[PDB]
Paper text:
DExD/H-box RNA helicases, from virus and bacteria to eukaryotes, play important roles in processes including ribosome biogenesis, RNA processing and folding, ribonucleoprotein (RNP) remodeling, RNA nuclear export, the regulation of RNA translation and transcription, and nonsense-mediated RNA decay. DExD/H-box proteins often contain accessory regulatory domains and localization modules, but their cores consist of two RecA-like domains joined by a short flexible linker. The N-terminal domain is commonly referred to as conserved domain-1, or DEAD-domain, and the C-terminal domain as conserved domain-2, or helicase domain. Both domains contribute to the binding site for RNA substrates and both contribute to ATP hydrolysis. We used X-ray crystallography to determine the structures of the DEAD-domains of DDX2A, DDX2B, DDX5, DDX10, DDX18, DDX20, DDX47, DDX52, and DDX53, as well as the helicase domains of DDX25 and DDX41.
Residue numbers in the entry: 307 to 417, 420 to 435, 440 to 476
The structure:
């Protein structure tokens, strides 16, 4: 059920400060609705939360520190639209990827060394056109190149100047 018939992009970012700056540029560039944002670490997910709260976004955070009931409440609320941005460390979108989500952002590329193809697919593929962004520091390009060869779908490049 699960393919890649969605527009994929990457942005080159020096450090997380630039990743968020870029993410802000996306927000001031197109209509959102709902978005999922995936991070590799608790520390980074937590950080992006604080960042977005300080910019008015209503964010909920799905880290691993949460109890079953806390996870239940976050997820239920995001599904029926009470939150707009869901930041998670979850390796996969299952349960959360409702129809209302237009954007998905890999705030960290799902990476011993090899990139995780099914993680990438579960995050970004769906089960009438999606949008997905990869926030990447210069030297993650080799992995991204592999992710692209693997799926034979091109991941286009953007900068601090969004057009589409
Ligand atoms: Cl962590
Ligand atoms: Cl399913
Ligand atoms: Zn999954």
């Amino acid at each position: 059920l699960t393919l890649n018939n969605i527009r994929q992009y990457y942005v080159l970012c020096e450090h997380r400060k630039d990743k968020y700056q870029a993410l802000c540029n996306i927000y001031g560039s197109i209509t959102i609705g709902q978005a999922i944002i995936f991070c590799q670490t608790r520390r980074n997910a937590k950080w992006l939360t604080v960042e977005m709260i300080q910019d008015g976004h209503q964010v909920s955070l799905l880290s691993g520190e949460l109890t079953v009931e806390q996870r239940a409440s976050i997820i239920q609320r995001f599904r029926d639209g009470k939150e707009k941005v869901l930041i998670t460390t979850n390796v996969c979108a299952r349960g959360i990827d409702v129809k209302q989500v237009t954007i998905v952002v890999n705030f960290d590329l799902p990476v011993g060394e090899e990139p995780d193809y099914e993680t990438y697919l579960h995050r970004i593929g769906r089960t009438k056109k999606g949008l997905a962004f990869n926030m990447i520091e210069v030297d993650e390009l080799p992995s991204l190149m592999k992710i692209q060869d693997h799926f034979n779908s091109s991941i286009k490049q953007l900068n601090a100047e969004d057009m589409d």
